[PDB]
Symmetry: none
């Protein structure tokens, strides 16, 4: 008794966009006033600390369209 | 007896957009006044701490259309 | 007994964009006022610390489209 | 017996004026039409006139900003 | 017996004026039509006039901002 | 017994004027049309006119910014 596996996915899909213009985009975050008082700061394992810091991303792609696809055949 | 597995997904999907413009986009977060008083800050494993900090994203894709598709086949 | 695995995915898929212009994009984050006081700062493993710092990304691709396509085939 | 004076006023304030025609969106506006018939014109003394205008005038004598700070410390 | 004075006022205030034609959306507005028949004009003395106008005037003499601060510490 | 004066006023404040026609979007606007018939013109004394205008005038006599600070530490 044979085993025959015919994995033939067919994809003709279109992922598209038409955009007339991307305009006046203004990312302007402002920090506050931040005061930390202690005798000790004591950070011991896998600690992430953000005191008064700003992390900023401005991502403006003319398309930014994504096709994400996965194929997985397992035989045992 | 023999085993025959036929895997023929057919895909003609359209994932589209038409846009006249992406406009006047303002992203202006403001911090406040933040005061922390202590004898000790003592962080001992896998601690995330954000004192008066700002994390900011401005994401303005002209399309931003996503097609996401997982195919999995298993035989044992 | 015989085994016959045929793996013939077919992709004709289109990922596209049309954009008329990417315009006046302003990324102007401002730091706050940040005051940290102690007798000791004591950081001991896998510590990330951000005091009053700014991390900025400006990313403006004319397309920025992605086609991600993992193929896997395991036989045992 | 001692004197300690700390003079640390912090200013993060904003003074802003926005005048006169900002941040508008016009999407596919039709073309305006103007017609005038006036064969014989006589303008004598101190005359100011417009005939058949289609003008998008913005006029801003205003919108000025004035910030004053005094910071006095007197010790005797 | 000792004196400690901390003079540490924090200002995060916003003063803002917004004038006169801001933040509108006009979507597919029709084209306006203006027609005038007036064959013979005589304007004699100190006349100010318009004929057949389709103007979108904005005029802002106002909208100014005045911020005054006095910070004053006297020790004797 | 001693005197310690710390004079550390901090300014991060902003003064901004925005005048007169900023950040507008015009997407696929139609062309405006102007017609005037006026064969015979006589303009004599101090006359000012426009005939058949289609003008995007922006006029800003205003929008000035004035900042004053006085800092004064007196010891006796």
């Amino acid at each position: 008794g044979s085993v025959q596996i015919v994995y033939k996915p067919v994809d003709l899909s279109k992922v598209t966009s038409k955009c007339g213009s991307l305009g006046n985009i203004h990312h302007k975050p402002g920090g506050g006033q931040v005061e930390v008082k202690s005798e000790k700061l004591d950070f011991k394992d896998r600690v992430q600390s953000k005191i008064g810091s700003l992390d900023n991303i401005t991502h403006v792609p003319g398309g930014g369209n994504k096709k994400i696809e996965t194929h997985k055949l397992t035989f045992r």
